[model samples]
Target: VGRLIYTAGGYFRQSLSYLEAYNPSDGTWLRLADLQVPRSGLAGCVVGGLLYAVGGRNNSPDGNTDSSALDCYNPMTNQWSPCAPMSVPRNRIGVGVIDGHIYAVGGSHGCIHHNSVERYEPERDEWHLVAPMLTRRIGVGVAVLNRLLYAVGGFDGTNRLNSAECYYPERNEWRMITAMNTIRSGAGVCVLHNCIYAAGGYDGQDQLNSVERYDVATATWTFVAPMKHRRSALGITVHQGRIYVLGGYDGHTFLDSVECYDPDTDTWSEVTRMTSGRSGVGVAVTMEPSR
Candidate 1:
């Protein structure tokens, strides 16, 4: 399988994990290198050969509510190094990579949601403010499809949002897209085969198991099969067309169960559970062989 995948535990405390490898020949899970620091609600993406882990909440009493810290992981060397810090500290930030630059989108400022957006250029080792999102949100889903940045549902601390939007670099503006069917916070979003997929998240009162899909071209959401277990703050990412739902807290307890969604059949299948049941963990994929 040798496909790359990444997941992050949304709000609350968390850390990041990589699937390392998927043997197309065998279909088994293999563990990869772990992140240097444990952070949840942190955003991640691959650029060149390195994976960049962005700012998030630390959850400790003395630790900062928001972090500006950035960590870079190199799978080739199995090591991590410090990178330039973000201009602002944010948790539950939406993240995506484009043209070798990392975009850290709207998130909470530890207390309130922000609409600011920033870009990181690895070559120059500096961060700069680009265009900001139209709505201020934290725990939103961010993904790059066809070279465009897509951002989806999250909370503005006071209310959950179903509104979705995309950033056009050429015009440097945010354009409103079709909103999700349900208003939820801490939802997971990914783009698969030109279709945008949004999964489990909290709908204010209860954890939701519902999964929905958006036709990028048509700008509409169609109902999809729900997850096996209800969850919020779960991490969703696409490795090879298949959508993977990672860890999240389900109100009663933290979840390690992993589920895979197949768009072809519109079904959900339970996969292997994570080794650790830690919520708020980050997930990513590497170029290494799937073990």
Candidate 2:
């Protein structure tokens, strides 16, 4: 129950792994730190000890270039830097971090579906432009609890999106949550104790071991414990209290398997098994461990 699960493997670039702890006291799998630049529908978040990493797509289906690159990792020294660059150029986006700044919603620049919403402030490195997402999505699934910022379920290029939203970055506005009875597209969100789950995704007609939960004071949408496999653009996190889920792409194989869930008893077990196999990566969790 410690190393606090983490992932940043750039979705479908092949080598990028991070599990380094999914021990709900006993389920084991520890091996973190990888990803210098791999690219695959990227999006990551964690601000305080740093973890940024946004934008994605660098060679998928052979149609390269689609990245507003942004990087920043510092598990105290496993260093990696270069941040602020995302005013457009996206790919399955939905990143989060509020209070210390960094918000990056909606995505898809390989041809439509991008309701921009930048807002980075890495201590003045600057980037601002929020309020734009009523549902022009792409692979989204972002999270930030008590301080608000939720934006789950995605893909709005004519399908896949159980529609969900809530961004109130101090009134910049965007509300409308509680939708997702499984109408997925690369799902993976977390907010543990205060609720907000949302695991595995897909559903352009299949591939989705669904898992849901969104209860911000009864704004409801509940159903949990699914995901024995069946993924789609995976990467979900929640460290310490468990809920890993990493790697994806089950629209015909490309997964490295990894699971955790366990909300006191809702259950989900597997763990480990990831040498490479991704879909659209980006995951984060850290109280600091030289990440």
Candidate 3:
């Protein structure tokens, strides 16, 4: 493991097992081990220096096979192994880690949308049902702040959603929070400096390039500088102080472009692109391996 971004899986029956890591400093991508299962629309998170590629299913118009199967990856060995599967199948899922547990938030399977939520314990190799959200949300953006897991804008089966909420694990409940300025689905979301930033997604009518930030303390949302291109289903993460948004579709085409935003200056700058165009991909950062 190292301080780098890794992209796994593929779409349209591409290299689903593929895994690659990009070094920010060197601007080079190194191909790693492929995933155990071929899946797209998957959610990934790292626990105990190991990467877990969770549920994935093709949300393709008619090709729906939601995979509850989960896999664990150790770059130390460059191998992927199986883990206990989720009882409810989901794709386009939102995932978060808190208190050593992984939370799988609202997800979908074709016409099936979910307000259901589940928590997994890798230690026990099990998943337990947790309190569900107030509304069904697919492709929700989730992050944890102050022990609370926040769920932001996503599609609600019928319409693009602008709503948001957070879960209080201690109490086993989800409390509604201020919604974003506009409806969005597949927006890149991440937490930085005590605020949750949600950027670029579809709003039913068209793709959006707008961005918003939520203050965890005050439970409010505000606008920020827009992205260079309208995007949705892009991967986002923070390294150092800047936020990086990777390849996402800009309405008509998949993007190979990459952009990073400066919180201090509230501006965006174009950066080197990925090896190829991609959308609906997963993103995660790893620190120096301790071996």
Candidate 4:
């Protein structure tokens, strides 16, 4: 089996439905089917071999209303189908999969921030509300580590946030964790070697290239080597011991550049760039089953 990096819907000049997959083996990108609904700031994750795209926003006459849409993609068939929508509409949400259930964390509804958390049960094709976050946020970075769901820095209605928290589904509750040193929104986060890394994002005033790593054991964060370019609303995935950061927006322009960090070397290096620039990209990694 081989690892495949999947990059999906994002925004360029407008909301985009484009989806593509990258094969690290050949350093190539193959375009996949476009999303049924054009959107940006959507959250995506893999659950039981299927890609689930959660809530996001679209440019509709309804006036920037968030979407409750949940769409599923099957790589095996290259097809997409709608699943149950979220209980509340949201964009810039964070999603993670745990024990076969997909969890949707805080985002925005209309112009309002949210602390709401919901879970989707694929077996039943239903969504149910769960314990909300301690802080309402949008553009939050989320990942599942050690069987717990962690929500990282994001934008509250007024300020950029450095706060971090984790949800223990078994207890059905969330507890505050060590916060990042830098306040950011739209950062890309992923767990590697048991430590969670929070990458480049937008601070209130500027796009950022700084990265931070959280030691779950010490409950502390440490600054790490920075990326070559600033990025916000980027996509991240862990594949073969490296964390890959995908297309995103800098303060001045959208980006197609790809960068990856190797924990062993504590370094960031450029990789193959996408064909076009984009931001708010949705990314996930999965193993291609052997034929």
Point to the candidate with the largest TM-score. 4
Q: List the residue pairs that clash in candidate 3.
A: 2-286, 2-287
TM-score to native of every candidate shown: 0.90, 0.31, 0.93, 0.96
Model 4 stretches with alpha carbons more than 4 Å out = 60-64, 287-291
Q: Between prediction 2 and prediction 4, which has the larger TM-score? A: 4
On the 0 to 100 scale, the lDDT of residue 148 in model 4 is: 97
Instruction: Please give, for residues 60-160, the per-residue lDDT of candidate 3 as tens digits.
Output: 45455887877888877887889998877878888899988999988887678889999999899999999999889998998888879999989888888
- After superposing all C-alphas onto the true structure, candidate 3 shows an RMSD in angstroms of 2.2
RMSD of each: 2.7, 17.4, 2.2, 1.8
TM-score of the candidate numbered 2? 0.31
- Arranged by TM-score, best first: 4, 3, 1, 2
**Top-scoring candidate (lDDT):** 4
On residues 147-216, what C-alpha lDDT tens digit does candidate 2 reach at each position? 8888888888988888888888778899886697878878888788988888878878887887889887
Q: List the lowest-lDDT window of 10 residues for candidate 2.
A: 13-22
Q: What is the lDDT of candidate 4?
A: 0.89
**Clash totals for all candidate models:** 18, 1, 2, 0
Candidate 2: list runs displaced more than 4 Å: 1-52, 56-69, 78-84, 87-106, 109-111, 114-156, 159-200, 206-233, 236-244, 247-269, 272-281, 284-288
What tens-digit string does per-residue lDDT give for candidate 4 at 11-86?
A: 8877778878888879988787789988889988899888878888876444555789999988877878999899
lDDT (C-alpha, whole model) for all candidates: 0.76, 0.77, 0.82, 0.89
Name model 3 segments beyond 4 Å from true: 12-15, 58-64, 288-291
